[PDB]
From a paper:
LEN binds the immature GagCA-SP1 lattice in a novel binding pocket consisting of three different CANTD protomers, two from one hexamer (denoted chain #1 and #2) and the other from a neighboring hexamer (denoted chain #3). The largest conformational difference is a ~90-degree rotation of the diazatricyclonona group of LEN when compared to the structure of LEN bound to the mature capsid. This change is likely due to the stacking interaction between the diazatricyclonona group of LEN and residue R18 of chain #3 from a neighboring CA hexamer. However, an ~8° reorientation of the CANTD relative to the CACTD takes place upon LEN binding, which induces an overall conformational change of the CANTD layer in the immature GagCA-SP1 lattice. Within an immature CA hexamer, hydrogen bonds are no longer formed between E79/R82 and Q50’/T54’/N57’ upon LEN binding (3d left). Similarly, R18 forms a new hydrogen bond across the 3-fold interface with Q63’ (LEN-bound) instead of N57’ (apo) (3d middle).
The Gag polyprotein, composed of MA, CA, SP1, NC, SP2, and P6 domains, is the sole viral component needed for the assembly and release of an immature virus particle, which is accomplished by the oligomerization of Gag into a lattice structure at the plasma membrane. CA is composed of two domains, the N-terminal domain (NTD) and the C-terminal domain (CTD). By contrast, the immature CA hexamer is stabilized by both CTD-CTD and NTD-NTD interactions and adopts a more extended conformation with a six-helix bundle at the base of the CA-SP1 domains, and the immature lattice is stabilized by NTD-NTD interactions that mediate the inter-hexamer contacts.
Residue numbers in the entry:
A (entry chain K), B (entry chain O), C (entry chain N), D (entry chain M), E (entry chain J): 11 to 239
The structure:
């Protein structure tokens, strides 16, 4: 077909999902970056998304449900296929799983043509709509230690989201240098500030190990009552 | 047709038209959800827009104007229509007013195919383009009583806007109780605050109907003169 | 025809109507950019004028009345058309509404030739003459709030003019930051100045909501009599 | 063709470029305005972009590289062309440079059809995408004079940007009145404010011809030391 | 081909480029994910590198020089090609520019086989090796303002690097919030910290417009001498 994706379109789509993540702007750009492409190019563009595993899982669920709807609307004709004709597509074929490049190209160049690529394109674009409406990406700045949460658990969440985040290694080191102490519970923040800027992660952790325990609660209560008295 | 509308796309279009009102980002979504849809499906999508009657009227005017332009571009050809072929569309025929689903299907799957859905799509896209460019939905946040506006007239305008506003009943009552008094000029706001928080609407109107009259002007003039005397 | 508009001429016309607006200097440029062009190209240039809707409505009225005058001068001959010959153009055909590219080209290359493009050019250029003489574009700097006008109405007028005005978005933001406060009458101007430079639009509108009311009039009268006393 | 652009699509596209400049908002609208339009109409739409010549150059570079890719994937046909069929398109033909309207219509209506318009639309979409990512239009608000920039060079840059600006003439004069003195560096701004608002441009340049010379530096240094002593 | 890449390999390679950027870990992964892959699949994997334009340019230069070497060592076949066999590959064909998928499949299935995919993989390996040794990605952490650099140029470079950065929008906003003032030179940093955290970018640029001018140098020199005296 003459409407296959060029290398520039693939790189543009990759950059689009990189900078714009899954903002609404990803919907029109995709809507123009895969017009007339056979479904395998659409699958290639769907595969080029790095990260956002949950979002693409919702996308896959949407595509599967719409393939089921497609199969519901068009019943499968239980009859022998004429040598001149070829089998009608099913929802999986529109998705591209059970259909090869040759079958898709033949479908889009039939008389009358079946616009398999465009149908899969609509399914994908409304899955993208669902992603934009519901999915919210996890950001390191959204990771703040709770009021009664242990510092080990907060550090585990911080590092899990940092690894899941898409960023450079150097900027990730800067993030774990700054936000780890920045977005911390006030009780742990007092200990972290008292430790000093040269304290390592292990030292900070054994310092906040005692927070929330009976000894720390007794100490802070004693400080409060000394301020009162 | 293989690109017929499906419940998921219709629900998604409804959700984007209610959630996003007529923000510019409604142009991509529509342009991605009606791709390949028959004009009947376009009309079905257009009917589900609740509220925004003014914008809907602008959109209908744009459709009619573009259909007139289409009819002027494509002149009517006389003579008997060939039985193998079928009669050519007009502007209203594209619009679906005088064309049934069978006629639209025949147009979209003929040789050569007349893409009635795509021309419809362009006309509708122009309609929403004008809607977003010019039309601004009336919001209860903007209903504020003018300096000389009677309190009764302001209450009537506020209630009309509330009736036209799309929102749940509970949040509508909350918006009433929190914005009818707040969004008033100081001349009425002072009286309303002096009235007390536990004031019914009838008491509100009765107390504030005296503003702007000779008595209220004389009282406020005397109060102002008290400071200078 | 050899005298169709090149892309550079179209861009030059767009720039002319952009920077020069509808100043008289637009008349000579249109007098030269479109010379010998068939009416289709003339309409194409007449379509790239963003904004100035009222001006082009006057221009359309001029063209329609000149088509009527042209029909008045040359009566329509009620007779069969010779197969070698072709129908003479009516008033609308010179404007290109009832005539396509082929008929316009044939008219412009007849024996004797009918200079349809030049006749339409004369009609259009007199339309621009009327636009230059009478039409005055709405400018933001012409938006000044009246002595006894509510601030909400002034804001509505200011923002309507801002939306209708052509400019960059950053320029529009700077203009609504400066001129909105700058172009208010003494009462609203002193209220805005007392509010402060960081006050939001809602705060300014709330403060000016009371201007012109009985309370504000009593307060300013009290201030004046205190200055007297 | 059935999907030829009507006047209102062209005018709406012109307005889109005028107001939205090259924000991402231009990508969907364009893709929704040229749906099914022949690449001749695509060139017609692209020509009406007033200003932003750098962005148009980037777009033309995109179209050239996409045409190169199209010629790369599609090999040049060899041997005599079948009289029933006609010559295969090339990248320049998709871009509309070499192909005429008749050839493009023949491609669109061929069996099987070659979607020249959609391919060219995707190429222009890629160009617009890189424009919105990278290209940043020059704005008068961003013209600020460097600490060591001579006032003459600052004025030259300011006026060049103002001439390149899309805004109207009267608002351009207003911009000259306010921003030119507002955006000067403190050394020039002190002199300009000492001159008074009545000073003309020539007087202002005369008074800021000396900022950076031995006399001015000596004078400011002496003033600072005298304030110290 | 049997060893055609699967969606998981493409996604894994994309993620490898996203996280590891261009580190020594890229060479092993690329050497194992694209094992036995058709050079068309190699090109698909190469197109997915979002950003790193300079590195990709270096890689393509390496591929071009390797193709030149391949054409140098392998002479061009002369005379007619045997119908049973097929034409020999060239350097561009190994690079995948001129070869089609069918040609590469025939090369790999030929007896004896021509391992086009492995040769292309080695060429890309050389390119990646040069990238990891020499190319260094631009990071906002490494953007700092020179001692004599005006704040406007620093801000422009900072924002250009930020736009080129691979990160999410909220993280980029956080970078703008902190690193823009953190990495300024002390002369600008003193003014920026005296401004306060509430200062906007425009206010910061206005305050720092004067550093390096005669007034600012005189003021700092006077302050230093007064501290001496
Ligand atoms: C060879 C080639 C031409 C191809 C192809 C190719 C072929 C088919 C499919 C596929 C398409 C549609 C359905 Cl409906 C199913 C299905 N239906 S089902 C009953 O649920 O199993 N299964 N498949 C797997 C099948 F068919 F192979 F079995 C599919 C894919 C999808 C494209 C896709 C990616 C995506 F992200 C979200 C989607 F909605 C669709 N990519 C995958 O599936 C692999 N994937 N999945 C997920 C997840 F689940 F998290 F969303 C993730 C990936 C990931 F990319 F790694 C990325 C991290 C995320 N690509 S090429 C050059 O591009 O590599
Ligand atoms: C069978 C079926 C599939 C169908 C169909 C169907 C068929 C035709 C039309 C129609 C279309 C185009 C023209 Cl050009 C005319 C016309 N030309 S004219 C000279 O102006 O009168 N007349 N019609 C009436 C006709 F049909 F009699 F011809 C039309 C509609 C429109 C679709 C539409 C809705 C819309 F909002 C805005 C539009 F631009 C277009 N919807 C209506 O018309 C009813 N409507 N109108 C308006 C208003 F005016 F306020 F915008 C409103 C409605 C509303 F939906 F109630 C909603 C509150 C708003 N739908 S279904 C869904 O029923 O199952
Ligand atoms: C397809 C193509 C070849 C063509 C054509 C084409 C064909 C005809 C016409 C037209 C010409 C003459 C008459 Cl006498 C009438 C008519 N007489 S009547 C009894 O009153 O209805 N009707 N028409 C509509 C018709 F013919 F379609 F029916 C016309 C136009 C005009 C050209 C024009 C533009 C203009 F600004 C002012 C004019 F005086 C004339 N443009 C429009 O009409 C659309 N327009 N109108 C107005 C308004 F009214 F506000 F001024 C506005 C537009 C706008 F551009 F959007 C812009 C905002 C302003 N273009 S192409 C490649 O160029 O796109
Ligand atoms: C007659 C008609 C049917 C037609 C046509 C017509 C035909 C072809 C082309 C064209 C198309 C594709 C390529 Cl790939 C090249 C090419 N490739 S190349 C190797 O560089 O020479 N050259 N062309 C010139 C060609 F064909 F004449 F040779 C083209 C244009 C473009 C449309 C276009 C405009 C644009 F802005 C950006 C684009 F990407 C494409 N318009 C121009 O290019 C003229 N232009 N250029 C530039 C600049 F350089 F700044 F970007 C500028 C203009 C401008 F519009 F003035 C504006 C200020 C900016 N229109 S009609 C009724 O519509 O007028
Ligand atoms: C159809 C398909 C199967 C295919 C294919 C396909 C075919 C060929 C090529 C190609 C291969 C080898 C050479 Cl030696 C040249 C050449 N030699 S030359 C004398 O320099 O012109 N030219 N080409 C362009 C050609 F072939 F079109 F002519 C090539 C590519 C490359 C793959 C590649 C990308 C890359 F980044 C670095 C590489 F080393 C190789 N992709 C491009 O080159 C496009 N690109 N370029 C650059 C730049 F240069 F800026 F770094 C950039 C891109 C980008 F990806 F956008 C990304 C931002 C960076 N892909 S599919 C489904 O995958 O799309």
């Amino acid at each position: 077909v003459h409407q296959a994706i060029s290398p520039r379109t693939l790189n543009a789509w990759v950059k689009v999902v990189e900078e714009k993540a899954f903002s609404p702007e990803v919907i029109p750009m995709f809507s123009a970056l895969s017009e007339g492409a056979t479904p395998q190019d659409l699958n290639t563009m769907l595969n080029t998304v790095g990260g956002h595993q949950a979002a693409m899982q919702m996308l896959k669920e949407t595509i599967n449900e719409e393939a089921a709807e497609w199969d519901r609307v068009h019943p499968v004709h239980a009859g022998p296929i004429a040598p001149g004709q070829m089998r009608e597509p099913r929802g999986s074929d529109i998705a591209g799983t059970t259909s090869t490049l040759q079958e898709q190209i033949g479908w889009m160049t039939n008389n009358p043509p079946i616009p398999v690529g465009e149908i899969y394109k609509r399914w994908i674009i409304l899955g993208l709509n669902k992603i934009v409406r519901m999915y919210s990406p996890t950001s390191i700045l959204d990771i703040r230690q709770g009021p009664k949460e242990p510092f080990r658990d907060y550090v585990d969440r911080f590092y899990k989201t940092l690894r899941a985040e898409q960023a450079s290694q150097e900027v990730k080191n800067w993030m774990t240098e700054t936000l780890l102490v920045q977005n911390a519970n006030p009780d742990c923040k007092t200990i972290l500030k008292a430790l000093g800027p040269a304290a390592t992660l292990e030292e900070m952790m054994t310092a906040c190990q005692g927070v929330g325990g009976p000894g720390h609660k007794a100490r802070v209560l004693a400080e409060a009552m000394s301020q009162v008295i």
